[PDB]
Amino acid sequence: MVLQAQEIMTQNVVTIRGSATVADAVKLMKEKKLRGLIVEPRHEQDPYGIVTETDIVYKVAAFGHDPKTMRVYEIMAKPCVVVNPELGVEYVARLFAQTRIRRAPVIQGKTLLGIISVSDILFKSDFVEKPKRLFIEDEIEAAREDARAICAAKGETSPDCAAAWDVVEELQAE
Amino acid sequence: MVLQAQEIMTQNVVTIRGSATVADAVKLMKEKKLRGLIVEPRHEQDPYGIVTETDIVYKVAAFGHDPKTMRVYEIMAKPCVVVNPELGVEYVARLFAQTRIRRAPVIQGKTLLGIISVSDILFKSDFVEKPKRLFIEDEIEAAREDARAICAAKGETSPDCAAAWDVVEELQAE
Amino acid sequence: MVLQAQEIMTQNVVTIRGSATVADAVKLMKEKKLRGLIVEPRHEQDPYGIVTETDIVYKVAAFGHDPKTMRVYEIMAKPCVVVNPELGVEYVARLFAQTRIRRAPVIQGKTLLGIISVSDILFKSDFVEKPKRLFIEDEIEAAREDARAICAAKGETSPDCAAAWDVVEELQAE
Amino acid sequence: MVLQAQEIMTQNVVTIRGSATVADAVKLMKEKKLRGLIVEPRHEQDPYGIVTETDIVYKVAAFGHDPKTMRVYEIMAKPCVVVNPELGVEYVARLFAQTRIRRAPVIQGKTLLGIISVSDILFKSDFVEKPKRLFIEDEIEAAREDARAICAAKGETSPDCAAAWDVVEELQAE
Amino acid sequence: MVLQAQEIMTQNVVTIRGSATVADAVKLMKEKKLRGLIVEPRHEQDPYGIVTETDIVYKVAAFGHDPKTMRVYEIMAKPCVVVNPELGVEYVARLFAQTRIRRAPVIQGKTLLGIISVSDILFKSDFVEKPKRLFIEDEIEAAREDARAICAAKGETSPDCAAAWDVVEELQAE
Amino acid sequence: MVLQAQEIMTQNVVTIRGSATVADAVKLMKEKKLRGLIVEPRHEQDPYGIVTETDIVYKVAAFGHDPKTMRVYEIMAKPCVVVNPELGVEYVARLFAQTRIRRAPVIQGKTLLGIISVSDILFKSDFVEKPKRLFIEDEIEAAREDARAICAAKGETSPDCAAAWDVVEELQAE
């Protein structure tokens, strides 16, 4: 029972059409105190998209472009990196680091279930009270696989077999 | 009926455990003429992973590290960027560009259906014979939304309404 | 009277010492609904620092490291990119884009006056109602410099001089 | 008395206007054996800018563009990452690494005092004879904070208190 | 006798002219099961170029651009990172990692001898059976240089001299 | 007769061994007013390397590491991106931009002939007086290839053939 994306995602999203102006998006984000908007798919075979406060500042504000005559579609990310609802939150954090994103839609097939962000991870995760320690756990599972092979090759009663599990023990200590 | 990821993905994958050696992976890739391996999840609440020929060359070969005593888990990407089976192939290409990847697992919920790569896109896509022209199509859909609003505000018979559709026409020409 | 950084920065910051744990930081950010903390300088000849929600998720959460036994200093940025209080908000947006940051301290000499973020820019800027159009304005100022030289070389009454200002006019039209 | 930016910056800068040609800049840099030029602000509420030899080679030379008909403003960085005059030179080096720059203006409020570059750091710093060892010093200051808390909780005479300072000692040894 | 680039490069290349269409390139790559094409120099003082499957997917497919009316020259890399025929394969792997490429032409003066790729490295290298361990070897060579200086300053018979070689020994152990 | 790398490279290099200290390198660079040093190959089957002022500042100074006890080999780039002596200087500029380097050794086979840097390009190139205009020239050569095919398919006397060369003419105008 590791904490899953869907357990900590935000269910309430706001949307906007691609052809709306960046000014419409800004208006809508201020009004609703928001950092992101989902870009509404035009139809069922059209993927979700996303437009962030950073998208607006980096792509519009930074050049002094006119938000009233640029469209959402010009600055959105489509498609995006999507998170499956059962992906453990450790792995979502890792995904976000590997890809340099800070939010992702949580999608089941191609239905939007919500949004998951670095704030969601920070505030609702169990990473403070249960560090998963992913590399260290992976390293231990390997010491186990070696011990199964060493015990199968040299016998459970061999000092080698006893040692290979003492390698799992000594890692489990640190 | 736009071409979907699953229509062009490779169904046959080969797998390897995280605790196998990078030498085991290299052996297995040579033998089967392969560029990628799926890292087998240890259990049902453990995400898919992937280890590429480039991972091996950049992370092992480049330093002269010993492949016989490094493990797959040390060089794999886990989790990865996943592609939903219905995502149109244009959008997969775009995903791959935005994230700088060249293959992704195609996943339904958390079942692996296959793998999709830049070769799959190049060889099996319809991008030569049906360029989707995504920005240009998005730009046109906006000219349509403007025309609906201009016609609704000033009447279908107005020269403004006739012009706003002539804006859709003139874009459709180029 | 272009809008200046200090006119839209947040004056209220919260701080934390470098030797506090990442758990102390997380606790403090949740409690106060915050995305950033200023790392308190140890003394007067020690620069400001900053630790963000993203720093915590990318550097701690993503590996399953234990926040109770890592320190702020291990994940903070020090020194940071600083914004002078009079820098126009267009240029702050641009700075943020060029350097891929989303907040910066606003500093006068080496006194902290506040913090300025992409949200501050989005919500409190005048970029919607007064696009500064920076490249286009720069392009026009050059057409002016050319016109001064062409008029000085060929006379104010020359058709060349009249044309070089008609070049400023025609750009001012688009 | 840690060495400060202003103690090692170059006071003599050369400037150029944004509307000057890249050819004017090249001419001016050759003549004066220079690697950088400050782009002169048009007025008092206009930030400093900078155009480097690398800017010219990467953005002009690399495409075979004509330097006689491109302008400085097209290739300059504005605004830039600025260094405060009291920032210790260790931290300037770090700033430069974090942001991938090799020179920065040294600015007081919004007055230009000079320029500081990687050469200035290399040739005039005290980093050879006094390595500041920043992480190691930060790590030690934390061991101190722990010792103050452990001594305050368990008494100065406790073996715990004596140990926590022996932790500062043992780090100070390596 | 360390394994050299030319010993493992692919001698058979296919070429295409810069003015051919991206569709011509795709046609040619499918037909010949290929991942790369060399762009034919127009003459003897024109450098080699290269167009990859990834170039096509990232730059053409990803936007839905029409391959029938874009040209190779628009998407190729020219010039490229070239590998000299005698460069050891460890160093080619490292080059590829430092520059984020996956293939390079092998060039002698300015004659093309072949192509070397991450697959060539993976399948034909000796990196599994003879890890070169480059940093560790470099570290050892330095311990040697120190020992020559310590022995020259204090005499071959000094315990210092015996120790400095015992430093080479102890590293050679791990 | 396009200007070649070797015509503008610096013939005089200074070298240093990999096992020398970063302090030795700094000493040597100050003394000789230098920005780069070639790392001397240990033998004939060992590639050239390079250590820059930026390498020293970013990797040593920025952390306050002790230059007296770090070695050149720890901070150098080996192998490097090499420039062939006949590569036109436009293409060297482009190489440098594509790879984000600012100097490269000029190598013939595996003999070092010199070093070429962005300063060499800036000060000794002909890019001001003869912009090569590379994309525009490539675009024109394609219009030529089309005209040869259109004339061969429809006859030299056809208005199509006359037009396809008028396409070369009209591009040659702009």
Q: What DSSP assignment string belongs to F13-76?
A: --EE-TTSBHHHHHHHHHHTT-SEEEEPPSSTTS--EEEEHHHHHHHTGGGT--GGGSBHHHH-
* Buried residues in F132-146 as b, exposed as e (16+ CB within 10 A): bebebebbebbbeee
Nearest to F94 among E42, E79, E135 (CB): E79
Closest in B64, B89, B93 to E131, CB measured:
B64
Q: How many helices (H) and strands (E) does chain F have?
A: 8, 5
Structure tokens at F100: 């984000």
Query: Is residue C170 packed enough to be buried (19+ CB in 10 Å), middle (13-18) or exposed (0-12)?
Result: exposed
Residues 6+ apart with CB under 8 A from A21: A67, A68, A69, A70, A71, A72
Is-cis flag, bond preceding A131, omega within 30?
Answer: no
E23–chain B Cβ distance below 8 A for any pair: yes
Contact C113, C9 (CB under 8 A): yes
Burial of F11 (0-12, 13-18, 19+ CB in 10 A): exposed
What is the distance of C-alpha A46 from the center of its chain? 22
Chain E: list its partners (3+ Cβ pairs within 8 Å): B, F
Picking from A10, A128, A85, the residue whose alpha carbon sits closest to that of residue C30 is A128
DSSP A1: -
Which helix (H) or strand (E) covers residue C110, if one does? none
Inter-chain touch D131–F65, beta carbons under 8 Å: yes
Helices (H) and strands (E) counted in chain C, each on its own, are 8, 5
- Answer for the pair A118, A96: CB distance below 8 angstroms, yes or no: yes
The minimum CA-CA distance between E28 and chain F, rounded to whole Å, is: 19
Instruction: Please state, as a whole number, how many other Cβ atoms lie within 10 Å of the Cβ of residue B32.
Output: 10
The residue numbers preceding gaps of C to N over 2.5 A in chain D are: none
Residue of chain A whose alpha carbon sits nearest to that of B94 = A79
Report which DSSP code applies to E78: -
- The pair of three-digit structure tokens given for residue F15, joined into one six-digit string: 């070298």
What contacts A44, CB < 8 A, 6 or more positions away?
Answer: A110
Rounded alpha-carbon distances, angstroms, from residue F5 to E83, E86, F85, F95, F123: 17, 22, 5, 12, 13
Strand partners, D15: D38
Question: Are β-strands A15-16 and A36-39 bridged in parallel, bridged antiparallel, or unpaired?
Answer: parallel
Q: Which among D73, D99, D146 has CB closest to C142?
A: D73
Q: Where are the beta strands (DSSP E) in E53-174?
A: 103-108, 111-117
Q: Of B102, F87, F49, which is closest to residue E103 (Cα–Cα)?
A: B102
Calpha distance E61→B120 (Å, rounded): 12
Which strands sit side by side in the sheet containing B49-52, from one edge to the other?
A: B15-16, B36-39, B49-52
Interchain CB distance below 8 Å, A86 and B110: yes
Is A62 an 8 Å CB contact of chain C?
yes
Query: Could you tell me which of A164, A173, A174 has the C-alpha nearest to residue A142?
Result: A164
Q: What is the DSSP letter of B77?
A: B
- Is B60 in the E-facing interface, judged by CB distances under 8 Å? yes
Instruction: Indicate yes or no: CB of C30 within 8 angstroms of CB of A64.
Output: no
The full 3-state SS of chain D, as one line of letters, equals: CCCEHHHHCECCCCEECCCCEHHHHHHHHHHCCCCEEEECCCCCCCCCEEEEHHHHHHHCHHHCCCHHHCEHHHHCECCCCCECCCCEHHHHHHHHHHHCCCEEEEEECCEEEEEEEHHHHHHHCCCCCCCCCHHHHHHHHHHHHHHHHHHHHHCCCCHHHHHHHHHHHHHHHC
- The residues, any chain, with a CB within 8 Å of residue C87's CB and separated by 6 or more, are C4, C5, C95, D47, D79, D110
**Strands, E assignment, B15-93:** 15-16, 36-39, 49-52
Q: Please, which residues bridge with residue F38 across strands?
A: F15, F50
Question: Which residues, numbered 93 to 122 in chain B, qualify as contacts with chain E under a Cβ-Cβ cut-off of 8 Å?
Answer: 93-94, 96-97, 102, 118-119, 121-122
Q: Is D155 exposed, middle or buried (0-12, 13-18, 19+ CB in 10 A)?
A: exposed
Question: Mutate which of F21, F82, F167 to test chain E, going by most E C-beta atoms within 10 A?
Answer: F82
Amino acid at B108: Q
Write the DSSP assignment of C50-74 as a string of letters.
Answer: EEEHHHHHHHTGGGT--GGGSBHHH
Judged on CB neighbours under 10 Å (0-12, 13-18, 19+), C104 is buried
Q: What resolution in angstrom units was achieved for this structure?
A: 2.5
Find the CB nearest F110 among E18, E73, E84.
E84
State the Cα torsion D78-D79-D81-D86 to the nearest 10°: 130
Q: How far is E33 from chain F (nearest CA, A)?
A: 26
What value, to the nearest 5°, has the Cα angle with vertex C27 and ends C25 and C28?
Answer: 65
D23 contacts in F (CB within 8 Å)? Answer: 128
Helical H segments across E22-114, by residue range: 22-31, 53-59, 72-75, 89-99
C82/D82 touch (CB, cutoff 8 Å), yes or no: yes
Distance from the Cα of E142 to chain F's closest Cα (Å) equals 5
For residue A31, count other CB atoms closer than 10 A to its CB.
9
| Whether E62 and B26 lie within 8 Å, measured CB to CB | no
Q: Are D31 and D61 in contact (CB under 8 A)?
A: no
The angle at the Cα of A58, spanning C126 to C49, to the nearest 5 degrees, equals: 95
Q: Under a CB-based contact definition with an 8 Å cutoff, are residues F72 and F50 in contact?
A: no
- What's at A138, amino acid-wise? D
Sign of CA dihedral B143, B148, B153, B154: positive
- Residue D50 has φ and ψ, to the nearest 5°, of -150, 140
Which one of A66, A122, A137 has the shortest CB-CB distance to C131? Answer: A66
Please tell me what DSSP assigns to residue F133: -
| CA–CA dist C82, D85 (Å, integer) | 13
F17 to chain E: closest CA residue:
E142
Q: How many Å apart are CA B54 and CA C16, to the nearest integer? A: 42
Residue B168 · residue B140 · CB < 8 Å:
yes
D48 CB within 8 Å of a chain F CB = no
Contact check, Cβ <8 Å, A131/C66: yes
Q: Which residue has the tokens 């080999």?
A: F73
CA-CA-CA-CA torsion sign (F121, F122, F128, F131) = positive
Pure H helices in B70-117: 72-75, 89-99
How big is chain D, counted in residues?
A: 174
Which residues pair with residue D104 across a beta bridge?
D116
Partner residue facing C87 (CB), from D47, D87, D135: D47
Q: Does the CB of C131 have a partner CB in chain D at under 8 Å? A: no
CB contact at 8 A, C120 and C99:
no
Which residue of chain F comes nearest to D135, CA vs CA? Answer: F63
| Cβ(F137)–Cβ(E78) below 8 Å | no
Cβ atoms within 10 A of the Cβ of E139, count? 17
Cβ separation A118–C57 shorter than 8 A? yes
Burial per residue of A139-157, b for 16 or more beta-carbon CB atoms within 10 angstroms, e otherwise: bebbbeeebeebbeeeeee
> Which of B48, B89, B98, B110 is most worth mutating to test chain A (most A CB atoms within 10 A of its CB)?
B98
Question: Closest to A142 (Cβ–Cβ): which among B47, B73, B98?
Answer: B73
F109: left (phi over 0), alpha (psi -120 to 50) or beta: left
User: Is A68 an interface residue toward B (CB < 8 Å)?
Assistant: no
Residue of D32, D53, D127, D137 for testing the chain F interface, max F β-carbons within 10 Å = D127
Of F19, F45, F144, the CB nearest to E88: F45
Is D80 within 8 Å of D50 (Cβ atoms)? yes
Tell whether C19 lies on the interface with D, counting CB pairs under 8 A: yes
Report the C-alpha gap between D84 and C84 in whole angstroms.
10
3-state secondary structure of B172: helix
- Determination approach: X-ray
Alpha-carbon span D5 to B167, nearest angstrom = 58
Residues of B in contact with E135 (CB under 8 A): 63-64
Question: Element (H or E) spanning A36, and its range?
Answer: strand A36-39
Distance between CA F73 and CA E145 in Å, rounded? Answer: 13
- d(CA E121, CA E87) in angstroms, rounded, equals 13
Nearest partner of D81 among A65, C100, C51, C124, judged by Cα: C100
Residues counted in chain B: 174
The beta strands (E) that lie in B15-138 are given as: 15-16, 36-39, 49-52, 103-108, 111-117
Q: Whole-angstrom Cα distance, residue F123 to residue D31? A: 9
CA nearest A119 in C: which residue? C53
Give the pairing type, strands F36-39 and F49-52. antiparallel
135-154 of A, contacting C, C-beta below 8 A: 135-137
Instruction: Please count the CA atoms within 13 angstroms of the CA of E107 that sit on its side-chain side.
Output: 23
Exposure b/e, B123-141, CB count within 10 A at least 16 = b: ebbebbeebbebebebbeb
Q: CB distance from C133 to chain A under 8 Å?
A: yes
End-to-end CA distance of chain D: give it in Å, rounded: 24
Q: Evaluate whether B133 touches E66 at the Cβ level (below 8 Å).
A: yes
Give the residue extent of every domain in chain E: 1-128, 129-174
- What does the alpha-carbon distance between residue C87 and residue D45 come to, in Å, rounded to a whole number? 8
How many CA atoms does the CB half-sphere of D59 hold within 13 Å? 17
Q: Which of D67, D123, D128 sits opposite F23 (nearest CB)?
A: D128
Residue D30 near residue F122 (C-beta atoms within 8 A) = yes
Q: Which helix (H) or strand (E) holds C118?
A: helix C118-124
- In single-letter form, the type of residue at position B117 comes to S
Between CA B13 and CA B29 the distance in angstroms is: 11
> Is any Cβ of chain C less than 8 angstroms from the Cβ of D24?
no
Closest to B38 (Cα-Cα) out of B124, B117, B122: B117
The candidate with the shortest Cα–Cα distance to E21, out of E79, E59, E74, E80, is: E74
Closest CA to E66 of B136, B129, B172: B129
Query: C92, C99, C171: which to substitute to probe chain D, counting the most D Cβ within 10 Å?
Result: C99
Residues of D in contact with F30 (CB under 8 A): 122-123
The secondary element (H helix, E strand) that includes residue A146 is helix A134-154
B47's enclosing H/E stretch is none
User: Residue C119 in contact with residue C35, Cβ under 8 Å?
Assistant: no
Whether the Cβ atoms of residue D167 and residue D147 lie closer than 8 Å to each other: yes
Task: Report long-range pairs for C144-152 (Cβ below 8 Å, ≥24 apart).
Answer: C144/C168, C144/D19, C145/D17, C145/D19, C146/D19
| F126 three-state secondary structure | coil
- Residue of D68, D78, D132, D135 to mutate for C, most C C-beta atoms under 10 A: D78
Q: What is the DSSP pairing of strand C36-39 with strand C49-52?
A: antiparallel
Picking from C19, C91, C98, the nearest residue to D47 by CB comes out as C91
Q: Phi, psi at residue A16, to the nearest 5°?
A: -155, 150
Measured in degrees and rounded to the nearest 5, phi and psi for residue E53 equal: -50, -40
> How far is the C-alpha of B104 from the C-alpha of E100, rounded, in Å?
19
Going by C-beta distance under 8 Å and a sequence separation of 6 or more, which residues neighbour residue C46? none
Tokens of B144: 């349509």
Helix (H/G/I), strand (E/B), else coil: C86 = coil
